[PDB]
Amino acid sequence: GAMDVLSEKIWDYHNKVSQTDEMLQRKLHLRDMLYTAISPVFPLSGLYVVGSSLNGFGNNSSDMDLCLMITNKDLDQKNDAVVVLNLILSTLQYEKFVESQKLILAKVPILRINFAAPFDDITVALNANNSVAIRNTHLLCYYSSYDWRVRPLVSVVKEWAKRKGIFTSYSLVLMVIHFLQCGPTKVLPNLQQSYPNRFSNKVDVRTLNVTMALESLSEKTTLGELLIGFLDYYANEFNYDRDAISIRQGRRVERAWRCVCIEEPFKKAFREAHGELQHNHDLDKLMEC
């Protein structure tokens, strides 16, 4: 009912669903196990952890997206990536700790792996050399760390959309970053535009800075006003025909396939969610839709 209550409630929901560090350690162990089995096939390769499991935005039941890097050239994803993934599938089918495997023909082919033993709660989705997943994860992780409010905000927005049928997790995260860039409260900057050679597309990904810490009206605004604002923004302000989200430019752009057009770094529901939350400030009533 009151908005300091809403702010703490959002925070509390965040901490119940967020990925524990124990879950993260387990995911890194399983990754090492995968690497031990994959290393004889590609001895110089690198198995990067990508996506929710590392970028700060994941919960505990989140898939572990992995990226196997083998070449600095660009791996064609029509033929060459399917072959590389089948070469890994051919080895993993003899490993005890691996339980089942699915190959997924998609724009970016996926090797989807399920485990046994104590890891049958973790699913892995592995791609072959799709380094744009690495660039994306790097950037999002600096957004995730820039302001303590981004992650809890993202946590409840992801759960609201799940419980209201509404859009992948990744889309939502980008909707949230965009809002925190271009809404009433300027909480996040345009990181690609402010640190241009640190997030540049043209850099070898082995160069990426992974320990740089980045170098007033915002601290006013609360978690509650942020979430009400977010729902307000997409309910009454964003034109899902005239406009698109661009992250690289922290600005909305003319759309010149999908409902919310989103350019990657590399509607009555929103109306009635805003109606509810703005009026009652009751997070339980929001996510009981």
């Binding site: 890194l28 690198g46 083998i70 994860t137 992780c141 600096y142 303590w148 082995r206 992974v210």
Partner: peptide
Amino acid sequence: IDFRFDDYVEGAKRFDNLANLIRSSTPT
């Protein structure tokens, strides 16, 4: 031999430390 592999072994282990970067910006 005929295809051009590159060394990512150290690269992939180093990428992990983003974990700490998030942890060190979460209030207690």
